[PDB]
């Protein structure tokens, strides 16, 4: 999965998140078309109560069905401030997309972090099942001990997501940030 954001000189904005699902999808190219094929069918609940590749679970609502669109967690998002487009973001990460975008919004609104600060800040996540508070490196050992004391099952794991965001000043100035978690990414303008 991958996400990208765009804002033009007129103030129009677009946030796109698209995917093949897993990296390279099935790895199957369709004949001589050169096009790789997705393995999006795994996003369906294969059997009630049985988790998929991302640990997500479902029932009848997300059950496999003809012509049905499998449930996705992709969240291209746009936040408005004082009536104007202010934050354009999104990210890959399957189940973690929700919490990653959530943190971008909270970091921006509640903590007053500039878009780059919000982007480079460490991330944590909890998706009910499994029952663990997943965290990246970057949080204070002291802080982490409190969480476990509170009853959280802290689990230090792999970096989460790849936000590609743009914050728009009321005067039209554009501020962007590419996730450090993705080598070779880039935010550029003119």
């Amino acid at each position: 999965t991958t996400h990208y954001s765009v804002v033009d000189k007129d103030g129009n904005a677009v946030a796109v998140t698209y995917t093949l699902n897993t990296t390279f999808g099935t790895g199957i190219v369709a004949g001589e078309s050169g096009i790789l094929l997705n393995n999006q069918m795994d996003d369906f609940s294969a059997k009630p109560g049985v988790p998929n590749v991302y640990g997500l679970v479902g029932g009848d609502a997300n059950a496999v069905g003809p012509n049905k669109r499998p449930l996705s967690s992709m969240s291209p998002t746009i936040v408005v401030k004082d009536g104007k487009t202010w934050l354009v973001t999104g990210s890959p990460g399957g189940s973690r997309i929700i919490t990653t975008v959530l943190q971008m919004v909270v970091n921006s609104i509640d903590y007053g972090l500039n878009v780059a600060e919000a982007t480079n800040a460490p991330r944590f996540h909890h998706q009910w099942l499994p029952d663990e508070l997943r965290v990246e490196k970057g949080f204070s050992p002291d802080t982490l001990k409190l969480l476990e004391a509170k009853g959280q099952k802290v689990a230090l794991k792999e970096a989460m997501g790849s936000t590609q965001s743009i914050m728009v000043g009321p005067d039209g100035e554009l501020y962007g940030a590419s996730d450090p978690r993705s080598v070779d990414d880039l935010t550029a303008g003119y």
Partner: protein, 359 residues
């Protein structure tokens, strides 16, 4: 909510600044394609479609023509809309198609076999958007990607590492795939040039004949054949029946800010709004980033949201999603009252909430 910060010289991390247009993506080359398009006069949608096609060439890991996704568009005039171009299960798809003889899900079938594919919507999604909200003809936004495919580009660290790590698990297991991404028995390495002649042909035909090339043309034929000859389900009828769909965005209000995100078939928008609704009841600013309390509150809020996700979310065209109740501030308040700043509630004691009193 405290005052916002666009960034100052004293910060540790600095955003990239621009006065006219900007593009943020996972790939330097794709980002530059987007910027060139804006410089040439195209709008955000035009640049977005160009970037999408470029990534389908330079970031085969996820950029694609054979996958699907979502797009959120907000016009300078405030009109905000969502484009659903998520894949559709084939007409022959069956509820238990991924269960083995013992009734247990076979991950191999839903991840690596020809049965794992849904009918692609990316091409349809980009055209629906370009036609209605763009200003440039398809051929112009596709051209940059076409050249990258035809003339090739240099494999960088990201692509080389991904081909080696994830590619090794599936790419060499298919002759046509191996012929493109593998070289001298190994995955392409950094510094090598990746030329994708077949993809260039597909792109050229789409730029020339429009989206019908993919859904009814030579490309559709190539997909249907690949399926028919290898136990797949996607047929020409499936491709001919695919349609991207413009939907109303899911949105909410958080401390005076309005948040717009994707609606079902995506679960993202609803739960982001729901969680924000929960957090609104707490003075997050006060606790601050990295504080045990802030993390405690958000961790708990999240549990309740994912619990509901597992129960009420699905393709809106097949099931009715209680989005109003899920994004109801009263419901969020009831969840917030259950949050103990000093003790976490086990996921075992948490179940999909009762929405009746909020519908």
């Amino acid at each position: 909510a405290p005052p916002v910060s666009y960034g100052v010289e004293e910060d540790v991390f600095h955003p990239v600044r621009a006065k006219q247009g900007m593009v943020a993506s996972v790939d330097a080359t794709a980002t530059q394609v987007g910027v060139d398009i804006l410089k040439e006069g195209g709008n955000a949608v035009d640049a977005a479609v160009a970037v999408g096609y470029a990534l389908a060439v330079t970031h085969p890991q996820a950029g694609n023509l054979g996958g699907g996704g979502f797009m959120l568009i907000r016009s300078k005039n405030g009109n905000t809309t969502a484009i659903d171009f998520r894949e559709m299960a084939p007409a022959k798809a069956t509820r238990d198609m991924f269960l083995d003889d013992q009734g247990n899900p076979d991950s191999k079938k839903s991840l690596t076999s020809h049965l794992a594919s849904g009918t692609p919507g990316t091409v349809a999604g980009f055209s629906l958007a370009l036609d209605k909200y763009g200003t440039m003809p398809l051929n112009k936004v596709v051209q940059p990607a076409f050249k990258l495919a035809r003339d090739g580009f240099i494999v960088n660290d990201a692509l080389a590492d991904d081909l080696k790590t994830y590619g090794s698990e599936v790419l060499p297991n298919h002759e046509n795939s191996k012929a493109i991404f593998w070289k001298e028995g190994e995955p392409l390495k950094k510094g090598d040039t990746l030329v994708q002649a077949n993809l260039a042909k597909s792109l050229e035909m789409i730029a020339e004949n429009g989206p019908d090339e993919f859904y009814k043309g030579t490309i559709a034929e190539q997909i249907a054949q690949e399926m028919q000859k290898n136990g797949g389900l996607i047929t020409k009828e499936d491709l001919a029946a695919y349609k991207a769909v413009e939907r109303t965005p899911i949105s909410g209000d958080y401390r005076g800010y309005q948040v717009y995100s994707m609606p079902p078939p995506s679960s993202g928008g609803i739960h982001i709004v729901q969680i924000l609704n929960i957090l609104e009841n707490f003075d997050m600013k006060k606790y601050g980033f990295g504080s045990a309390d802030a993390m405690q509150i958000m961790a708990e809020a999240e549990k309740y949201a994912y619990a509901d996700r597992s129960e009420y979310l699905g393709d809106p065209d097949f099931v009715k999603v209680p989005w109003q109740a899920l994004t109801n501030k009263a419901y969020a308040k009831s969840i917030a009252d259950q949050i103990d700043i000093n003790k976490a509630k086990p996921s075992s004691e948490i179940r999909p909430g009762k929405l009746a009193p909020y519908e």
